[PDB]
DNA sequence: ACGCTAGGGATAACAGGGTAATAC
DNA sequence: GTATTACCCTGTTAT
DNA sequence: CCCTAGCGT
């Protein structure tokens, strides 16, 4: 059986390659629920087949949390993650961090959990069947952060930055954390966009579902 | 005065596109 | 040539 | 995602 060290230097129409891909069927439990929180977060699941196959593409300023999700999808990621440096409009210096996992039908199984009658989608009960504690740990990792940044403050108020979905899509993703895991939270608008707001009173449930999945690089995000 | 908020800005993300490296 | 496809790349903002 | 000006008390 081929060894990703034969292959993670092969063209990608490489027969060998091919070979190690065929070798692999399905993505392991942590890969699966680890990668609903990211898809609900900062990464970008794709297809350029019609749904025959997926990969996933990631982006981080964060090099350590780059390095732990390569790590996590470790043999569906060839490369090490590359260093990408662009100039702003403002001809600002913007590092990041790039990365991706090659395209596979063992992916096909996240991407499903984002299409109803044919579209990606938020699902009214992804949340209810499918998001983890560990889920929530990557989402949280990814798109969560503080209600309140001024120093000193005690509110215990978290949120979730899902600016780029449906006001009922966020409504839907709220009624699962709501019913799930006792969340006390509500949507709240920012510039004409939803994001979660998960009142202080719910702090310690919150942080004692996602405390064992996250890394020390991200504690800053939480209150 | 001080704690919230919502408003706001410069990213730190998300989305797609293009091609050098294999196959036949 | 034509078909593949992982690893860059750039377009653009919602975060 | 974070910051912070300035409303509300
Ligand atoms: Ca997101
Ligand atoms: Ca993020
Ligand atoms: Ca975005
Ligand atoms: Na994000």
């Keep these: 059986n081929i060894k990703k060290n034969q292959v993670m230097n092969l063209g990608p129409n490489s027969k060998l390659l091919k070979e ?6 399905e993505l392991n439990i942590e890969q699966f629920e680890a990668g609903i929180g990211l898809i609900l977060g900062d990464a970008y699941i794709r297809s350029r087949d019609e749904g025959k196959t997926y990969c996933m593409q990631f982006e981080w300023k964060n090099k350590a949390y780059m390095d732990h999700v390569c790590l996590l999808y470790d043999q569906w990621v060839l490369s090490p993650p590359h260093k990408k440096e662009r100039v702003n409009h403002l001809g600002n210096l913007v590092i990041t961090w790039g990365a991706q996992t090659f395209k596979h039908q063992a992916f096909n199984k996240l991407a499903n ?16 069947n499918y998001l983890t504690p560990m889920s929530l740990a990557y989402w949280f990792m990814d798109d969560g952060g503080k209600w309140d940044y001024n120093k000193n403050s005690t509110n215990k108020s978290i949120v979730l930055n899902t600016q780029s979905f449906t ?13 799930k895991f006792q ?26 579902l996602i405390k064992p999945y996250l890394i020390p690089q991200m504690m800053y995000k939480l209150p």
């Design 20 to 25: 190690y891909k065929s070798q692999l069927i």
């Design 113 to 128: 959990l984002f299409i109803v009658n044919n579209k990606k989608t938020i699902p009214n009960n992804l949340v209810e």
């Design 183 to 208: 969340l006390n939270c509500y949507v709240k608008i920012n510039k004409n966009k939803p994001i979660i707001y998960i009142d202080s009173m719910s702090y310690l449930i919150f942080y004692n």
């Design 167 to 179: 006001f009922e899509e966020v409504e839907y993703l709220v009624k699962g954390l709501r019913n």
